[PDB]
Write a protein that binds this ligand. Sequence first.
Ligand SMILES: [Mg+2]
Ligand SMILES: [Mg+2]
Ligand SMILES: [Mg+2]
Ligand SMILES: [Mg+2]
Ligand SMILES: [Mg+2]
Ligand SMILES: [Mg+2]
Ligand SMILES: [Mg+2]
Ligand SMILES: [Mg+2]
Ligand SMILES: [Mg+2]
Ligand SMILES: [Mg+2]
Ligand SMILES: [Mg+2]
Ligand SMILES: [Mg+2]
Ligand SMILES: [Mg+2]
Ligand SMILES: [Mg+2]
Ligand SMILES: [Mg+2]
Ligand SMILES: [Mg+2]
Ligand SMILES: [Mg+2]
Ligand SMILES: [Mg+2]
Ligand SMILES: [Mg+2]
Ligand SMILES: [Mg+2]
Ligand SMILES: [Mg+2]
Ligand SMILES: [Mg+2]
Ligand SMILES: [Mg+2]
Ligand SMILES: [Mg+2]
Ligand SMILES: [Mg+2]
Ligand SMILES: [Mg+2]
Ligand SMILES: [Mg+2]
Ligand SMILES: [Mg+2]
Ligand SMILES: [Mg+2]
Ligand SMILES: [Mg+2]
Ligand SMILES: [Mg+2]
Ligand SMILES: [Mg+2]
Ligand SMILES: [Mg+2]
Ligand SMILES: [Mg+2]
Lengths: 51, 159, 49, 222, 185, 58, 148
Amino acid sequence: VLKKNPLKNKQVLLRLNPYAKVFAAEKLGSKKAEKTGTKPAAVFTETLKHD
Amino acid sequence: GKSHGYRSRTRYMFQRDFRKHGAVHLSTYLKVYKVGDIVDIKANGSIQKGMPHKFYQGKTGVVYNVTKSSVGVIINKMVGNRYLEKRLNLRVEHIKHSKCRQEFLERVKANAAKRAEAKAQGVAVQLKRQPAQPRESRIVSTEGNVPQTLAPVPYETFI
Amino acid sequence: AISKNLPILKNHFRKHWQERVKVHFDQAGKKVSRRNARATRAAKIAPRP
Amino acid sequence: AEQVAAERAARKAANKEKRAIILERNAAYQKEYETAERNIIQAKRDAKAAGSYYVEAQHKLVFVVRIKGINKIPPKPRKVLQLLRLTRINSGTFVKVTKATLELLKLIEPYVAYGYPSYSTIRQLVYKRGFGKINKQRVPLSDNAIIEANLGKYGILSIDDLIHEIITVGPHFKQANNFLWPFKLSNPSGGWGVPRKFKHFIQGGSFGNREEFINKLVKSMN
Amino acid sequence: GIDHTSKQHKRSGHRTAPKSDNVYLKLLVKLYTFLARRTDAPFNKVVLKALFLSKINRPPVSVSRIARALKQEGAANKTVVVVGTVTDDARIFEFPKTTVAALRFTAGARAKIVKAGGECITLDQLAVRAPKGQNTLILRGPRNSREAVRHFGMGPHKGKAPRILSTGRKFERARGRRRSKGFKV
Amino acid sequence: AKSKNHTAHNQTRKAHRNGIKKPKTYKYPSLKGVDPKFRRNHKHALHGTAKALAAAKK
Amino acid sequence: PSRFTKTRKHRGHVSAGKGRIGKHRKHPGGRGMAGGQHHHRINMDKYHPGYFGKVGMRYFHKQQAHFWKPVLNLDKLWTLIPEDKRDQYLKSASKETAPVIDTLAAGYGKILGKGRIPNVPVIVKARFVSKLAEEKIRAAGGVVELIA
RNA sequence: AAAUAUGUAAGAAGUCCUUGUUACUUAAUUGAACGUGGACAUUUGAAUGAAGAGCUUUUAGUGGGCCAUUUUUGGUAAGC
RNA sequence: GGAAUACUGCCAGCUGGGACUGAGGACUGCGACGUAAGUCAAGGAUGCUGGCAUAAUGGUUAUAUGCCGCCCGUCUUGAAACACGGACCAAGGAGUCUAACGUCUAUGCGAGUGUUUGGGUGUAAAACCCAUACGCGUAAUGAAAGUGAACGUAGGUUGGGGCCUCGCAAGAGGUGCACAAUCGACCGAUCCUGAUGUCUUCGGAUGGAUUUGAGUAAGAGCAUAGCUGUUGGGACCCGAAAG
Ligand SMILES: [Mg+2]
Ligand SMILES: [Mg+2]
Ligand SMILES: [Mg+2]
Ligand SMILES: [Mg+2]
Ligand SMILES: [Mg+2]
Ligand SMILES: [Mg+2]
Ligand SMILES: [Mg+2]
Ligand SMILES: [Mg+2]
Ligand SMILES: [Mg+2]
Ligand SMILES: [Mg+2]
Ligand SMILES: [Mg+2]
Ligand SMILES: [Mg+2]
Ligand SMILES: [Mg+2]
Ligand SMILES: [Mg+2]
Ligand SMILES: [Mg+2]
Ligand SMILES: [Mg+2]
Ligand SMILES: [Mg+2]
Ligand SMILES: [Mg+2]
Ligand SMILES: [Mg+2]
Ligand SMILES: [Mg+2]
Ligand SMILES: [Mg+2]
Ligand SMILES: [Mg+2]
Ligand SMILES: [Mg+2]
Ligand SMILES: [Mg+2]
Ligand SMILES: [Mg+2]
Ligand SMILES: [Mg+2]
Ligand SMILES: [Mg+2]
Ligand SMILES: [Mg+2]
Ligand SMILES: [Mg+2]
Ligand SMILES: [Mg+2]
Ligand SMILES: [Mg+2]
Ligand SMILES: [Mg+2]
Ligand SMILES: [Mg+2]
Ligand SMILES: [Mg+2]
C-alpha cells in the first residue's frame, strides 16, 4: 500500500539486500587502499610540463 | 499551360552517361531471369521500347513473368496512405540483378557452414550480427613517438 | 441529391399526394357493418341460403 | 490438516536458502567491482611508469534523461524519443552503447541530457525509483520475489542482480532494461546550474553528452 | 504532458456481456463465465465469447453440415457443439446417431436427430457432461453467405453486386457495364 | 475573388494518422498477367500431378 | 420514439449537429437525381454502373404469366412426397411400386438436376426437365413423363 | 559531385539433398513451373520499441484557412 | 625529500532543526533483533494531555482589503471592436410525420416466412381463431430465342480457433468449422471444334479458348421493432424580386 524507500528505512534495506549488514560491519564504504610507490617516467613529466 | 507528359522532367534521368553511348553490350541479353528474382530498374535511354516510367527509376522489384524479350516486375507503390502493387512489363535492357539478396544468401551459406562445423563440438555458435561495439582499452607508447605540441596559428591574408 | 452507396429509389410523391390519402380507420366498423348486412339479408330471405 | 505450521516452516526454510544465495552473490559482485576499479587505476599508473598512456575502454552504458517538454518536436526526433521510451520530461532510461544507439542519440541531442552513470547513481536510481513492467503494469519492486518471478529465467534473482546486469552490460541487458519501467525523475533540487537549458553542455547549456556530470545531475533529480 | 503513442481511454472493441436481455441467456453466460474463470480449458472461453455474439455472427448450422463434420476421421463419436441455431436439411437422406448441443433446434432438426437416434442437448447439460469440453467439436455456420455481404466493397473492377431494388433489362446493364455503351466498368 | 491554389500542408500528418501500413504478403500470389502458354501448360501439369498423387495415395 | 432521438441531445447546442460553416441549407446539390451526368457522376459510376442508356429490345404488352416456370432441383425433389410415406418409398427401392410425383401440382414448371437423389425409382411428371435431371432420374431407375 | 531526403534485403513462406507431372521448352531428363521424402530450432540469424496485431461495415463534420524557422518564385517593396 | 591541504568523487558513516501528509481497517507477506519466549521503526498513526461544549469552529450572506477579470450571441484566418442582433420581463417559439430504402442491433420462426385484403368470433375499433392466394426467399445467365449448377470423402495447397492421442511439462502427431490467399471443377453468355444420325438441312455429342456473369460448390431467409443515414414530400424554422 505504500512505497518505503531503501537508503532510508534500514528495515527495507535489509529486506532487499542481506549483504548490507556485513557491508556496514566491515565498513566497506571506507576501504583503505594499499600504498604503491611507483613513479611516472621522465618523458611523461617533461611532456606534461612542456610549453 | 502546365505539361505532364510521360517523360516529363526526365532529361538528366534518361541521359545515357559520359563516354558510354552507343550499343549495349551482350551480357545484358545473356543474363537469365527467373520468376522470383529480385531486380533493379534503371532505364536505358537508347532503348525506347519497354521503358519504365520515371517513377520506377531506382526501384527494386520481383520478377513474376518471363516473355520473349521482357520481364514482368512487381513494385509496391505508395498511393495516398497505403501501397498498391504495380505490374511492369520491362525489356531486359532496363533490368539488372540486385546484389543485396545474393549478399544475404552468401551470409546464410557461411552461417550454415559455421553452425554445422560447430555442431560436432558445441562451442557457443554466435551466429547473429552485432553492431560496431565501443573499442576496448589499449596502451599507447611514446617510443619514437614523443608527443608534438600544436598551437593555433595567427591570422594572415593569403591573397 | 445523389450521395453514398444506396439503391436508386422511385418514390412517386411529386404531386399533391397528401390530398389523396386513404387511411382505413374504418376497417373494424366496416367488418361489423358487413356482418350486420349479411344477417339482415339472411333474415329477409329467411329460408334461402 | 493444520496447514499453518508445516508448509509455513518449509516456505521459511526455502526463503533462508534464497537469502543465502543472494548474500553470496552480492559478496561476489562487490569483490569484482572493487577488483575492476583497482585494476584500472593500477593500469593507468603502470602506463605512466612505463612512459606510455593508458587509453581506457570506451563506455558501454549511458543514462539518458529527457529535458524538453512534449510540444513542438520534429517527427524523426519525436519517433526516436518514443522508441527510447522518453515520452515525458524528466524521464530516464539506460541505453547500451553501439553504433545504432549512438546514431539515435545524435538524432535526439537537443532534447536530452545523457552521460555515463556510475555504480552509486545506478544503485540509488534502482533502489528509490525502481519499477518493473509486469503484464503492462508499473509495479514497485520493493521485494526480491518480483524480480525472481519476472527475470528469474535469465539468472536474475534480486535487485542487486538487476543492478549488476545493468552496470556490467551483460547478455540479458536488453531484457533487464526493458523490464525496468522508465524512471520518473523530478526537477533537480539545486537547479540546473545554468541560466538556460537548451544549449549544448559545451556551450554552457544542458543538452548533449555531459560525460561524468550526469551523475551529479541525476542524483540531484533523484 | 505525455507524448502519447496510442489513443487514450479506448475501449477493447470486443463485446462482453451480450446485448440480449434474454434471462436464460444471461443464466447461460453466468454458468460459462464461472467455467471459463475456473477450469483453465480453452473451450469454455471460446463458447463464452460465442454466447456474446450478435445474430449475423451466429449463422445457423445445418444438419448436413453436422453430418459432414462427423464424417471426418476420428470425429464420429464427438459431441457437436453449436452456439446458435441448428436448422435441418432435406438434401441429406441418412443421418448418424450423434449428440448435438445447441442454443436452439428447429422442429425439423430436432426430429431428424432424434429419428436417427442421437440426442439434442442444451449448453448447460453440455456443461455438466463435459465441464472442460471433453471430446467436443465446435461448428460455425458460414458468415459470408448473407445477402448484405454481396454489396460490401462495391467499386470499379470489384465484381461486387450493386445495391438495387428492381432487376432485369434496363436496370443498370448499360453505359458502364458493356463496351458497346461507352466503357465496361 | 481569388483563393489558395494548392498545398500539401497537413497531408503527411493525415496519411500517418492510420496511414502507411504495408500490403499483406501471401503464399501463392495470383497468376494473372502471366504468359498464357505457360498457364495452359501449367493447368495440364497440375492435373497430371493430381492424378499421380491420387493413384499413389489411393 | 422521440425520447431516444439525437434531437433531444442537440438541445442547447447551437447548430443541432449540422455545423457552423456549412449549414443545413435546403438543397445544395439539386433535388432527387439531379446532375447524375454532371456534378454527381462519380457516385453514379462508382456505385451504379450501367445506369444511363438502353440495352436490348423492347417487348410491347408483356404478361408475366407466359413466362411462369418455377424451377425445382433434384436435391429437393423428394420433399414433394409426404413424410409418412417417404420412409416407406425409400425402403422399398423397387419398380412396379415407384411413387408418382406431380411437380406441376406441386407448382413447378421445370426440373433441374443439381444433384444426388437416392438410388430409388420415381415417376416424375413435369412440363420441362433439364438434360442432366432426366439423366440422373433415369440413372436412379425412374422415368420422366411429360405433361401439359 | 555532396549533405539531407529515397527503393530493396537482413530466413521456417529459409537453405540444401533426392526425384514425379506437362499439351510448355530443349538436339537431348535439357530446362521451366508446381509437386512426394529427409536434414538443419531458440543467438531462428542486426539494433531499439511494441502501448496489443490484423480485418470489416457504416456514418458526421470539413472541402474560405492563416502564422513561424529554414528552402523558394514574381515584385522597389508590403502586416503583398 | 617528506608531508599537508585544495578540488573532484564514494560510504548499505553518524547526527540536529523545519514543513506537508496519516490513505488503509481482524489475521495472512517479506524481513530484522534474540538460544528461546517473544519483540520491532517489518504489506499506510498511534500514545499522552488541555480548553470549549457553544455561534467558539464552520456554513450562508452583505461589505472591506490584496491580486486578477473587456459583452454576450454570430459569421470569420482573425471580435472587446469604430462588424451585425440585443432597452426590459412573461408566455409562445424551430430536425417532425409519412412512402420506399442502406448498415447495425434485438426478437420469433427457419428452407421457409408473413394471422389483421377477407372470413369466424367477441366482454365489440381490443383480445382470440382461420382457408385459398399473394409477396419476398429457396437459381442463375443471356438483348433474346433459350439453356440451366458433384470427376473427386462437394476438390487440391498454405494458414487456421477448438477438439483427440502421446508426454510431468516443453513440445510432437491427427482432425481441422468460420475466415484468408491461391490453383482447379460445375452452370449461363461469347468464340471455336463438329460424333452417331438425318424432313439434307436439321440435330449438337465430344473436346477446347490471354474472353465474360450481381452464379454453383451440404441453403439463410422472412417478419416485427429501435438508433443512425437516404430520397420524395411545406420537410429544422422565418425570408424574396417574380410567375
Ligand atoms: Mg498507490
Ligand atoms: Mg544519369
Ligand atoms: Mg513506337
Ligand atoms: Mg531552493
Ligand atoms: Mg533559466
Ligand atoms: Mg479553397
Ligand atoms: Mg490555377
Ligand atoms: Mg460542441
Ligand atoms: Mg450531424
Ligand atoms: Mg447557424
Ligand atoms: Mg452541406
Ligand atoms: Mg464554404
Ligand atoms: Mg466525407
Ligand atoms: Mg465531402
Ligand atoms: Mg569533499
Ligand atoms: Mg458565523
Ligand atoms: Mg469563521
Ligand atoms: Mg462572514
Ligand atoms: Mg458583492
Ligand atoms: Mg474585490
Ligand atoms: Mg486587470
Ligand atoms: Mg474579413
Ligand atoms: Mg477599431
Ligand atoms: Mg455597419
Ligand atoms: Mg449582416
Ligand atoms: Mg441593435
Ligand atoms: Mg417558455
Ligand atoms: Mg409462400
Ligand atoms: Mg391470405
Ligand atoms: Mg416484386
Ligand atoms: Mg479452395
Ligand atoms: Mg424524410
Ligand atoms: Mg414565403
Ligand atoms: Mg416565367
